[PDB]
Request: fold
Amino acid sequence: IQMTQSPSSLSASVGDRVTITCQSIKSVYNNRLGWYQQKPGKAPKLLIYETSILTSGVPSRFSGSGSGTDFTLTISSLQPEDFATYYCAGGFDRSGDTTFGQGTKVEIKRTVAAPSVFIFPPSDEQLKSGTASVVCLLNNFYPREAKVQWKVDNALQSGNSQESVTEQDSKDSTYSLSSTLTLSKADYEKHKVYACEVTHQGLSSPVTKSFNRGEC
Amino acid sequence: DIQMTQSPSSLSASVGDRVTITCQSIKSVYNNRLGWYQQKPGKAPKLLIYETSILTSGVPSRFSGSGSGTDFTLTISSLQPEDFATYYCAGGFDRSGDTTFGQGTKVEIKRTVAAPSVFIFPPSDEQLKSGTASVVCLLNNFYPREAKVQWKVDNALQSGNSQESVTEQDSKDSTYSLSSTLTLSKADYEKHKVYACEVTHQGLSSPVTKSFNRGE
Amino acid sequence: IVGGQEAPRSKWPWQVSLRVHGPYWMHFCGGSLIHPQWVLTAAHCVGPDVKDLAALRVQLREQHLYYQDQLLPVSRIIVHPQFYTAQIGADIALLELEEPVNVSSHVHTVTLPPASETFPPGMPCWVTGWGDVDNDERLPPPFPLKQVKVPIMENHICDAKYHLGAYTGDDVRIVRDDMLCAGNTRRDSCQGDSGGPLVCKVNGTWLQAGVVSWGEGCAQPNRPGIYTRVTYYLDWIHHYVP
Amino acid sequence: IVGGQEAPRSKWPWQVSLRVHGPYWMHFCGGSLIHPQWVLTAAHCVGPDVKDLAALRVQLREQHLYYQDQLLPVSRIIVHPQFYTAQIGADIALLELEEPVNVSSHVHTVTLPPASETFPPGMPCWVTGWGDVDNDERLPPPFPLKQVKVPIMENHICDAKYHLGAYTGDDVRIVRDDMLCAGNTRRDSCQGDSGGPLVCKVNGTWLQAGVVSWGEGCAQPNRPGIYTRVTYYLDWIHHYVPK
Amino acid sequence: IVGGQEAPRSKWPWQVSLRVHGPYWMHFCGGSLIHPQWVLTAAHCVGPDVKDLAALRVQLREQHLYYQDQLLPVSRIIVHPQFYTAQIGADIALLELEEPVNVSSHVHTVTLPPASETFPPGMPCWVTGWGDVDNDERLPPPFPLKQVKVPIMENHICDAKYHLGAYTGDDVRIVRDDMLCAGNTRRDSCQGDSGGPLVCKVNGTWLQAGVVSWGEGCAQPNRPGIYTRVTYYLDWIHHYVP
Amino acid sequence: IVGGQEAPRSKWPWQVSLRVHGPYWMHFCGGSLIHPQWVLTAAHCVGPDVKDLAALRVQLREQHLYYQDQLLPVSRIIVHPQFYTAQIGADIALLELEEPVNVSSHVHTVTLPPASETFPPGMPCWVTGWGDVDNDERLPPPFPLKQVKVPIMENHICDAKYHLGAYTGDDVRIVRDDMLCAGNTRRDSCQGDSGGPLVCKVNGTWLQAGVVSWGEGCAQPNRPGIYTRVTYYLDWIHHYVPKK
Amino acid sequence: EVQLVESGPGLVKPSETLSLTCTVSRFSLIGYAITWIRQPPGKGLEWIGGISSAATTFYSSWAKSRVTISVDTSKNQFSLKLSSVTAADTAVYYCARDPRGYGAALDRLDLWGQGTLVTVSSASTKGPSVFPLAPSGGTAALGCLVKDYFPEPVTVSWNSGALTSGVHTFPAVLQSSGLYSLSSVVTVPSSSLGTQTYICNVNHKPSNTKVDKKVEP
Amino acid sequence: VQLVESGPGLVKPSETLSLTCTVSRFSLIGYAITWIRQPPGKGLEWIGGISSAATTFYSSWAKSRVTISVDTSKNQFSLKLSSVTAADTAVYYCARDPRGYGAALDRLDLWGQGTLVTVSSASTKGPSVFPLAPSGGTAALGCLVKDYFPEPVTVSWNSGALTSGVHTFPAVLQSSGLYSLSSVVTVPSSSLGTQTYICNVNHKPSNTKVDKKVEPKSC
Ligand SMILES: *C[C@@](*)(O)[C@H](CCCNC(N)=[NH2+])NC(=O)CNC(=O)[C@@H](N)CCC(=O)O
Ligand SMILES: *C[C@@](*)(O)[C@H](CCCNC(N)=[NH2+])NC(=O)CNC(=O)[C@@H](N)CCC(=O)O
Ligand SMILES: *C[C@@](*)(O)[C@H](CCCNC(N)=[NH2+])NC(=O)CNC(=O)[C@@H](N)CCC(=O)O
Ligand SMILES: *C[C@@](*)(O)[C@H](CCCNC(N)=[NH2+])NC(=O)CNC(=O)[C@@H](N)CCC(=O)O
Ligand SMILES: [Ca+2]
Ligand SMILES: [Ca+2]
Ligand SMILES: [Ca+2]
Reply:
């Protein structure tokens, strides 16, 4: 690949002008440079083609500019729906020298929102099937960047928990994340307090959520 | 005259709920001459249904019209946040002037309780040059509309000095914003120091008080 | 109108023009004022498919189309229930106007005949309209209302003519009893004339004998123009029209 | 043909194209080889008016129109005596070819059904032709023969659909007993398909159930295509065509 | 006329409508009465090929086409010798009428400008005609004469616009010095408006600035209407017209 | 092609058909393969307005249109900068194909002439195409490639003919020096033939003399077919197309 | 793309006659009917009258005496004239089209105008005085107080249309003075203050006033 | 206009994944189809394409192990990728170049919906749904959608009726080689014990539909 997108990711407020640049060392063949918008769990969409031509139906806030080795996608007034991964793609010849750019993730900017930390003990049906799966829910927060730790009888656990993060909501622009510590029911049945410690930008002093074992 | 009755005069429903607005007349409608209008605040009414049941092109299938003679019904199978508006039926009984509108039905979205964001604004130095002064208390994005704002000038309760105005329910998050403006003479504004607005809402466990010290 | 001349300003005060929305309210059929609140036309003009009334207007007797227009709204379309196609029959319809017309010297109603009236050959009959001047030949601007004296032919004679140079069995009736024949190769009605009147002078009065329905081509050999026999549908007409 | 795809070279060997003189022998209707000396078509293609045979030729099963033409002369046109218009009924005709066709693998006859055959819904039926691809939309060059699987609808059901958004009284029959219904808004026959066959598989054999006749528009809501019920006219066909 | 409204009965008394024989004397171009015996039109209307004068008539200022027609015969067609095509230039012609017109309040001549007149942007200019209302869209019945106020654009500005979205070299002139530009995407002349006048008010008098000539489409982006610059051909006009 | 017959399968291997998207890739102009990566056509086919290449394909020599198509994509359109309209002149264009054609017995290039070549009357020339058979008369299906032997006329003679029954001054030139005349009332090219070749046999070799450009009507009295004189634009053609 | 436009004076003195015009841009309306509807503030829709396809006027129960509706085909306009106006006539005036060209219909008003506010008052037009609602770590609120103007309406934008999210222009309140006051607020991050410029664009069409005020902490 | 990718969702390693790009009620004669893939969480990668003139062009990698073809009679395009590894697990897309190029990427106007191809020795499995039981104002509750194969799983609440506050997290591959997820929802504490919560989990690859009824406990 010879298509350098800059930045790799950006965050902007609604109504802001957004500029994503696509640059190459070799010059583009015949204005052969297009821009794609990929919304999560969807096929990319062609927005701009042949450098500057806009696909019919695509809003006028999207424009393409440039020539040779330097190109730019512009979003004059960023809308909440515009969050996606934008990829440029170009051609240098007619026989195989075409690539995609690494992509740029565009994210909508909002105010800092502290998370709401929730600990969930393993359901009795899962314990009856021989597994202990602890869930530490984190809910509606900005930014995504948060730290979760799992303490079992005050002993800090390592590589036995698995986090998972949702995308950016077009309603409140926040995220949510699921830390899930898994162990056997036998390993469960030998410890009292199961604690989850959460550290965020909105958290002045961390929030610890904990429970004492069993179906008490 | 006016002889068409809509029932109810106003309703509140959650998103996805089936909504039924009935239009009744004593005289029978002329030639299926019964239409339904949707009026979003500060906009011209929109024709949704015409000739009892015919749907205007582009209007969502969630809107349907039914009935005959003297009894008619507008149905919203799955109420959406944007569906917030005043709905009016309108009919014809003859071809020479016997046509009226129904009294209208205000449809309001129900959603989870939301607490306001309280803000206070001291009178501008620009305004203090003239004889009048205005203190503004803002209550941002809450549910339901009901809320009470109290003015405490050096802890003393204020009466007949303030005026409040509510925004129409948001098309997207279904919340409200309220502004309470206290108006005082420059002479009385100088007589006091502690200016505060005490807000009592359903979404607040204890009343939120926002204040400022004069000459800061 | 195939053959014939431009009508005088005075003549045919009952003549109407049916209009369809578009770049302009274009003429597409004719009809007759039979009551200050009713128009008599052909069902094929407005059917068998249900039509949006927003797309239709009526224009009262004027010499030329579009120059002095005052388009009248229609409140109801009543197509004969037995109507599907012109050749099958029952090609008759009524239009109820939203407002009653103020009758005068230039604009007034046509008399319908008694049921006993047969309209035999020899009868002085005239057909009027703003339709095609010949096959696939439109009436050119300034669009004058045209008139033509047409000869009445008996149904069996006409039916026999319709079989000449046709594979249809002689025992198979083409010209039906609710139909009437008039015209020749020089004088006839054409496309755009439909709904329009076929009027005959009966003891000093003009009676609408027929409604322009169909025919094979326009003024074709052995193919006289076919009209809906008004006598056949009098009871239906008068169920709605006072 | 509205909807459907291009037919394989093998399929529909009975399919014929009716031609009319002009700057070229242009296609105007379809038909089916029902006997080595007879082609079955719709009467409206060749009537009710008497036609000069100098102006007509038959073209046997080929993949595309005009590319590999061998035009066959017609010696006689036999239009059903009861025919005047498609909506009235008896829209059936026979063409006697001046020379018999020597039947092969690519060119052979279609089987006519017994009188007892009803052709109820569920039946796998196909209609074929070189006519319009949509309303007022001609089949583009290279003019491939098209095929579409059409659903059979009962006459009373079809007749009820025909009355929806029509002033015609419910007691007034539109779909007559000599007619058959097939199609929907996605699959249908169109202008230029007329005279062409509607064939259904009945116990491992293709039988011609109908002849493309009429319909309001092409693949229109509540307007299925109307075909001539071949069973209705078997006695008439076999008065001319050897059993 | 693309954009603009129907002209009042009073306005544009010099406006003529050129006719061609057929099912009727149909409108095909406009022109202006510049003398009681002369009409000024576009050469492309009547050339470069020699035309039979039997096939041509002139119709003086009337509100609607074909209603109150009184067709005038033409005795001579004088096409500028330098004319071959509109884009090449010299798209100007004169028609000598067989009889002189009796000038009045509703029918009189247009003033031609002095050679010194430049017609710069800002000038209040109007173009009039019975031509197409939009691209491939005819003027519907009752055929009213239409008028539109068009903005004057400088030749180099206009020529630069004509090169936008075109392969033609920038050094290759499209808008020639015998041509004039007026119009935008909302206001313009169209097919059937050719020959007609582009008049501008200069010190309280209407002067014919241009003749409707050509353009790419009708009221298209970066394609203003091109008119023949009347000043350029004054000497030629006055060799024939008194 | 007005007059003339259907071309044999062998003849005119350089003949191309330009197509336009729609209900089918319809024929609208012709052209000639002058290089395995280049096609020579008339500018009016593809200009003066800028065209979307998505809407264009090239079809190599085949006997009939649409029956055995293999549509080739175009990568570049090069219209002569001096081109605005056919009557003005410079009605010449080049299409660069996205892929080079593998030349054969049925599909190969036409030879361009030397600059010194004048193409005087008498020469045995032929024009080929799938365009109109007469005025406002389309080539009927199965769309065979048509050929017609056309007589070459000198520019001044042709110019004089073009003035007969025209108001245009005799001193005003109609047939320009970058143009060539060929045809009569029985033999001629027509609408849809544009961009197609006018080839003449010069010392046992077929040279493309001209490119179908314009004319008043089709095979009209005193109106011969006007073609772009290929010699006039050789230097421009060879600025893009490899000499060999 | 089809538009109906109401035009006319926003302020009418009592006893006088309000004159409104309904115009139709880039579209003719020969076979159509135009009806006039009004809507008192906070109240519902009321029919005034209408003109048919055949230029026939139909007027409601009330009004018959004091209302006149007409057509100027040459201007592509419809008129409404309401004589001897009182504060009871203060409403939003709408013109709508019946595509059947009826004149006395109401059940199929497909196209509507934008609506025009007509205020019946002896009071004179007054331009507003715009004052800043100055901002106070995380979130910050800021606005504009549009005090003492007359009549309604006043339109408030921020950064000339550029700032739309978080903007709340409140409905106007009639004060003791008989003048309107209004506030337009906006929520922004506290981090963006001093780095970003916030200007409210107040527009009072009745007095031809446009004020642009920069809000500062 | 629609392009549709068809083919096996699960391919065992060393085997060959065969995909087809179909075209519904649209010509496609003068056009080109290119194949693109997108590894989970990664970006777009070009495989290769076929031109308007049936000419194949393949990327730097792939060349050796990839075959693209056309069946005009079927209106289909094929993709055949031999000797597959877990590195080939991606979402496969077919897109159209309206210029009919074959080796372009800059003007892929029409795209298919995408087809997930998972390269694994593992077999298909239904999920096991477990309740995340709630607990004075606002309460949180959810569902644990453990051990299944392959992707995807669709989670709704009260059969579509509850949409607000719902957060279904992205799936995670476990040591077992079996994916798992969760789905959380915030409700008022007042509504518990009066409102019955049901999470309706749907695994189309195994045809499984589980409705777990979330209720409160005691510790
Ligand atoms: C609907 C009405 O305008 C026409 C005119 C009737 C023709 N009159 C005479 N005298 N020939 N009615 C129809 O077109 C009804 N259908 C038919 O006439 C068809 N048989 C032929 C239609 C045609 O040739 O366009
Ligand atoms: C004669 C033949 O080409 C056509 C094909 C039958 C139409 N098929 C379906 N499924 N609709 N037959 C006709 O066109 C017979 N006449 C009619 O269909 C008329 N009712 C209207 C024709 C039209 O809408 O163009
Ligand atoms: C001769 C006259 O009717 C027309 C009208 C001039 C068009 N005016 C504007 N503003 N476009 N003149 C022509 O038709 C001369 N030929 C052309 O204009 C061609 N370039 C365009 C032909 C076309 O698109 O029909
Ligand atoms: C563009 C191309 O397909 C045609 C064909 C050339 C016509 N050949 C002969 N010998 N007449 N080129 C044009 O149509 C260029 N324009 C003209 O020739 C015009 N003067 C008239 C077009 C017409 O008569 O329709
Ligand atoms: Ca006809
Ligand atoms: Ca049709
Ligand atoms: Ca021509």
